[PDB]
Write a protein that binds this ligand. Structure first.
Ligand SMILES: Nc1nc2c(ncn2[C@@H]2O[C@H](COP(=O)(O)O)[C@@H](O)[C@H]2O)c(=O)[nH]1
Lengths: 115, 112
């Protein structure tokens, strides 16, 4: 099955439901099931990449596309005071789903340090 | 307008530079929030991610690829967190878009 069998691969194939914000041929944006801010969503590639540490050089455009889609979705969601984008890599990064994804959090003041 | 990151790019003030190419610069954060905390910034003066253009897509991804290579070179084999802040709610401290890379400790949840 294209995309693998992590939770995110199954969401991509519409096998498990999600609250989808935006979808194109390269990525999917959907709300996080455990939001850490009043608005908290994810932008993920449809191509399965386990983690940023194994991304290829030719994945540059795709990774940038996650950020462009993330900022567009944030504007569409009315996050006019700003937001924070986060990638969690590995154990120290707090990663729990090994399919690359960008968090976008807003709707409140975010604090420093970022965890 | 110009920012302190513009001065760093132009080598007018010092920073602990990790990596440079023709389109970005990576350097340690002067106020580190983790044992390793560095920034990857484009040389193009994009003020904030909310105004990035579609043509900037591969450049933004280049910041992340450079970030993950610098992280490996700095020994962050247990992982790290990448952060881009936008605006006042995002806590953006400098209006020149920059990717934070933090590691060398457990990063926590929520991410601020
Ligand atoms: N929408 C949705 N989000 C999920 C599901 N399972 C896990 N998540 C979210 O995916 C994120 C994984 O990010 P990580 O912890 O790997 O950085 C977490 O914020 C978690 O709440 C799910 O079934 N549906």
């Amino acid at each position: 099955r294209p995309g693998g069998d992590t939770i995110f691969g199954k969401i991509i194939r519409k096998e498990i439901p999600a609250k989808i914000i935006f979808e194109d041929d390269r990525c999917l944006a959907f709300h996080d099931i455990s939001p850490q801010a009043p608005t908290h969503f994810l932008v993920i590639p449809k191509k399965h990449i386990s983690q940023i540490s194994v991304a290829e050089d030719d994945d540059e455009s795709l990774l940038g596309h996650l950020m462009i889609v993330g900022k567009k979705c944030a504007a569409d969601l009315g996050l006019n005071k700003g937001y924070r984008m986060v990638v969690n890599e590995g154990s120290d990064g707090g990663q729990s789903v090994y399919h690359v994804h960008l968090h976008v959090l807003g709707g409140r003041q975010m604090h420093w340090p970022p965890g």
